[PDB]
Nucleic acid binder design. Structure first.
Lengths: 64, 65
DNA sequence: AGGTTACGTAACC
DNA sequence: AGGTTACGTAACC
């Protein structure tokens, strides 16, 4: 059977490990919410930029 | 004394095993989703950078003639 | 070395 | 009722 010191170390190592898993879980939950707002905004900017390119392409098609 | 019955011990084990499974299934799903989202962010950002260049190439071409 | 894998214990709600 | 909260145990690498 593990010594009193090894027992104590296993409890502490698990306490720490358990906390890191919780921190990581919460960090991923926030990343999905953030990366979803980030995706919805950069894709809206791409709509405006592709419409801006379609505008300049016909404006060059006309003036040339 | 106050010790749970053999059947209750078995149920606590089963319930914990099932709880752990659900928690891990959600972990793998999030990990996958965050990867799908990160690569999508990197993809639509490269596109945004291509559209910002295509909006300057066409403005230089429509500035000379 | 002790972080990690792996499963358990039991009160609590 | 048993899912959930809360920690522990120890071998493995």
């Amino acid at each position: 059977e593990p010594s009193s010191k090894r027992k104590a170390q296993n409890r502490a190592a698990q306490r720490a490990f358990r906390k890191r898993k919780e921190d990581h879980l919460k960090a991923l939950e926030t990343q999905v919410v953030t990366l979803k707002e980030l995706h919805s905004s950069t894709t809206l900017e791409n709509d405006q930029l592709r419409q801006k390119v379609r505008q300049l392409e016909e404006e060059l098609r006309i003036l040339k």
